[PDB]
Design a protein around this nucleic acid. Sequence first.
DNA 1: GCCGGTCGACCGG
DNA 2: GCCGGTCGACCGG
DNA 3: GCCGGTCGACCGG
Lengths: 254, 249, 255
Amino acid sequence: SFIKPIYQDINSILIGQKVKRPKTLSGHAAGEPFEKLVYKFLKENLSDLTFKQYEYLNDLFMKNPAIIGHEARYKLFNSPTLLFLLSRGKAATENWSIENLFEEKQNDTADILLVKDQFYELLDVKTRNISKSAQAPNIISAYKLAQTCAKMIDNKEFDLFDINYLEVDWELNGEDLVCVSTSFAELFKSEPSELYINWAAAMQIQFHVRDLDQGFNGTREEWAKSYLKHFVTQAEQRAISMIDKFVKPFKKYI
Amino acid sequence: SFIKPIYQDINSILIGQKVKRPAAGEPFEKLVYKFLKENLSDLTFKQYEYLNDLFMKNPAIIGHEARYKLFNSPTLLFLLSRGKAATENWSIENLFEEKQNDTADILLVKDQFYELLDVKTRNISKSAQAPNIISAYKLAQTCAKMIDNKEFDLFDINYLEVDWELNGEDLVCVSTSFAELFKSEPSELYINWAAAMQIQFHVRDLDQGFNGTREEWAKSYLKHFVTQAEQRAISMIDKFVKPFKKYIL
Amino acid sequence: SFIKPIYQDINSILIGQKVKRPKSGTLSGHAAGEPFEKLVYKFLKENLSDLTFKQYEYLNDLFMKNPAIIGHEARYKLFNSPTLLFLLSRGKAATENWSIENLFEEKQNDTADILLVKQFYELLDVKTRNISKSAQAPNIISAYKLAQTCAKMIDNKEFDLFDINYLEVDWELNGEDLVCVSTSFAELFKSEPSELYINWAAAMQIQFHVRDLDQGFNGTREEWAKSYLKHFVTQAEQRAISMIDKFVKPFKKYI
DNA sequence: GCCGGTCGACCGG
DNA sequence: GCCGGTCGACCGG
DNA sequence: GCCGGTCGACCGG
Ligand code: NA
Ligand code: NA
Ligand code: NA
C-alpha cells in the first residue's frame, strides 16, 4: 500500500472535515464527497501516484498517439488481470481520442488508483453513517473477485496489484456532515475463507472496514486458490438455499 | 390509479422545467409529490408520512401489537410497516422518517384503496439497462398474502418514469411514462437475481395487455417466480462453479 | 506457409488495387470481392508459379501423368493420403469421366481457393469483407468437415502434411470500383481449437474474423485434432439441447 | 438482439 | 456475533 | 457482452 505509510496523516486531516448535507441521508445518492476529500489529499501528498480510474486510462492513451484501435490499445495494459479490472468497453476504447476522453463510470472497480514502478493499488472508499448501526456495505463483487483470482493464476500475476479499502465515518451535525472516524484494510491480508458473500446484494462481498481481519500469512497464490474454493462452495450453498426459501414456501400456490 | 386521471397535468408541469444542477434525478420526484400534495391534498402521502398520521390519529394505541392492528390488512402491513422496535418506540416526539428501503415513494389513498406510486428517474443522455423496479421476492410474498387473506381489491403498484438530461448548469425533464404493474403479463416480468432479485423493465416499454383477474395475476406471477428461482439455481452452477472447479483441487 | 514469407509484398500490392462494381449490382455472396481473390492468385502465380495451383488445376495435373490410372481405385489411390483425399478428391462419377477432353473445373464447394505445395500442402482460402460496415464473422470452414479431417488425421497419423490458412482482404466502395484498404493473415492450426465458434445454422461453419483469430497454440498438430474433436462433440450435444428449447417448446403450444 | 452484472450503502413486521 | 434482503439506476474486456 | 440467424445456389465411395 502507498497510502498506509501515511494513513495516520489522512486520518488526522479527515477527522473534523465537514460537508454540506444534500439538504435523504442514505443511499448511493447521499454518498459522500468525503471521497473527493480523500482524492484531494492523496493528490497533494502523492501527486505522481494519485489517479482516478478514468484519469489513468486517459493518461495511458495520451502518451501513445501511434497506438489506435481497441486491439492495439488493450495491449497497452500489458496485463490480462489489470485489463479485466481497469479497462473500458470495446467501442469506448475504440472511440477514445483527444476530444473525447473517459469520464466517471458508475461500475468502475476503483475510486482511486495509485501506481509506482509497475505496481497498482486499487483503493475503494467507503463512507458510513455512525448516527445508526447498519449492515455491512458492498465491498466488491464476489464474482468479479473470482475472475480476478482465476486470471492471476493463469498469468502468474501475484505481484502486481492490491485491493485496499478506506472507511470514513461521519455523523450529522447541524446543516452538515462531519467525519468522526476512519479505518484502513487490505483485502489480500484478510482470511479469504471468511469473506461473507451476499448473493442477493449483487453477489457482493460485505464487511465494515473497521472489523476486517489482517492475519493472512500465506502467499498471494494461496489466497486466490483459497478464495476460489470458498467461492465455489458458497455458490453451491446458495443454489440449494434458494429452493428452500424461494420455492418450498410457494409451491402450495401452484 | 388516482394519478392516471391527471397524468397529463403532471407531464405538462414536468416537461421543460429546469432545476439547478448539483440521486441526480431526485429534484423531479419532489416536483411530482408537491404537485400531488397540492392537487390531491387529501390523498397524497409520503410512505413515512402516512404511518405518522395513522399513529397520530390513535394516541391511545401504544405498543407494537396494538399499533400493528391499525393497518387492518396483513398484506398492507407487510408493504408499509417499518420495524418491531421502530413501531414500538414510535412517538409524537420520535416520528417516522424516510427509509431507503420503503416500498413506495408516494402513497395515494381513498375509499380504503391504496396506490403505491414509485417514480423512476432516467438520464436520457445514456442508453442504459432496465432499472430496478421492485424485489421479485417482495412481490412473491405480497402475492402470497393476497391469496391467504383474499385481498384482491385493496391496492395497486404503479410506476412513473421521469426522463431528464443535463443542459448547461441545469437539469431538464424531456419526457414521461406511466404504467401499472398489475396490468402487465406477470409471466413476462424479468427477474434479475444478482441485481437484488429485482424485476427490471423500462416503464416506457412495459406491456399493459393483461385483462385477467387480480387473483389470477397473483397466482400467475408466483408460478413464474418459482420456475425462475429453480432455473437460477441451475444457472449458478454452470457459471459460478463448473468454470472454477479447476482451481480448487 | 509459403506465402507468409512473402506477405509484405502481397499486403502492399493489394492495398490500392481496385475492381469495378460487379455488374453494378449487390455486393454480397460470390459477387462482391471475388475479383480480389483473382488478383491474389495473379500474384501468387507470377511469383510462385513453381507451386501455385487453383484447387481443380492441381487435380488436373495430379492426373495426366498417370494415364494408366483411370476410374476409381487407382485414381483414388493416387492420393497417398486419406486426408488429402477427403479434402481434395472430387466425386466418384467425376473421377471416372476424367480425360484430356474432359478436364476438371472449378467447383463451388471446393475446400481451398489456391493450393501451394512443395510433399507439403498449403490450402489457402481468401476472405473479403466490406469494411464500411460492422458485420458478423464470415463462414471460415465446415466444422463437420474439420471434424472428419481431424479424425482421419489421427487414424492414419498424418499430423504433418498440410496447413489450412486464410487471407483477409478488406475493401471499401470508392467510385465506380472497390478498393482494398487492409489485409490479415492467419493460420487455422495455430489458434485455440477449443475456442473456435461453430455456427450450426450457418452450415455448421466455424466463424471468426481472420484479423481477430489468435495464433498462439502450445502443442503439436496431433494435440490439435484431439482437442478439436473434444470441442466439436461437446457443441454438437449442446446444439441438440438448444434446439428443443428454441425450435420445439416455443411452438408446442400451437399443436 | 436477447440477457444480465456492478457500484453505493442501508437495520431487523 | 452471525445472517442477509431492498432501494436506486447504471450499457456491453 | 457474448451469441446466432439469412439469403443465394450448388450434386453425391
Ligand atoms: Na466496490
Ligand atoms: Na422499488
Ligand atoms: Na471456406
